[PDB]
Amino acid sequence: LFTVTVPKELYIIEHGSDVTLECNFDTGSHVNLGAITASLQKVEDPHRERATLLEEQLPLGKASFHIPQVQVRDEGQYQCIIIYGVAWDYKYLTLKVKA
C-alpha cells in the first residue's frame, strides 16, 4: 500500500519566523513521479493559501511545505496529502505559533 508518515506531528514556531512542514511517503518502486501530487491543506481554512510545496525534495520521499513569516492565522491543524497515480494517503500536522 502507498502510505504517508509524519515523523514530527507538532511544529512550534516563533511568530514571524519561517517553517517547513513535512511528511514522508513510502513506495516500493523507483519513484516514478511526475505522477505525484502533494498538498498541505489547512483544516480550519480561503486562499491565497500559503504553504508552498518544495518539489526538489520529492525524490527524497518527502513532501515539504514552506511557510514564510508565520502569522497567527497559520496556527492550527493541516492535512499532509500525497497522491500517487490513483493511490493516496494523508496525515495530520499541527503548527503552533509562539510569541
Binding site: 500500500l1 502507498f2 502510505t3 504517508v4 509524519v6 506531528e9 501530487t37 498538498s39 491543506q41 486562499h47 492535512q79 496529502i81 497522491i83 490513483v86 493511490a87 493516496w88 494517503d89 494523508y90 496525515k91 495530520y92
Partner: protein
C-alpha cells in the same frame, strides 16, 4: 457526499470477522477509496483500499457500497475507524466519513 460508514458501533467476538460498510460514489473522479484506523493521537493509519492480509475491501453489486472487513478480529483491533475519499475540487481535500467504533469482545471458554 462524504462517504458514509456503518454501523456507528460494531461489536464482534474475538476470532470472528468484523465487517463495516462504506458508501461512496463519484460521477466525475476515479479515485481509490481508503479504509483507516485512528491512532490515540488521532492520526489516520491506512489499513486497506479499493482498488489497491488481515484487512479486506470488496465492492458490492450496487457499485457504491463496499465491505471493509477485519477478517479475524483480535481484541487489539478494538478502536475507531473511518473511510475516506479524496477530491480535487474545488481544491485537494480528504472527505472523511463519520467515525465508527469497533469493539471486539472476549470469547468465552
Amino acid at each position: 457526499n462524504p462517504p458514509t460508514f456503518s454501523p456507528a458501533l460494531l461489536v464482534v467476538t474475538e476470532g470472528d470477522s468484523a465487517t463495516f460498510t462504506c458508501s461512496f460514489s463519484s460521477t466525475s473522479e476515479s479515485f481509490v477509496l481508503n479504509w483507516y484506523r485512528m491512532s490515540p493521537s488521532g492520526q489516520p493509519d491506512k489499513l486497506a483500499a479499493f482498488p489497491e492480509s488481515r484487512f479486506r475491501v470488496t465492492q458490492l453489486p450496487n457499485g457504491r457500497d463496499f465491505h471493509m472487513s477485519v477478517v479475524r478480529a483480535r481484541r487489539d483491533d478494538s478502536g475507531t475507524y473511518l473511510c475516506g475519499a479524496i477530491s480535487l475540487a474545488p481544491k485537494v481535500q480528504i472527505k472523511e466519513s463519520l467515525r465508527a467504533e469497533l469493539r471486539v469482545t472476549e470469547r468465552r471458554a
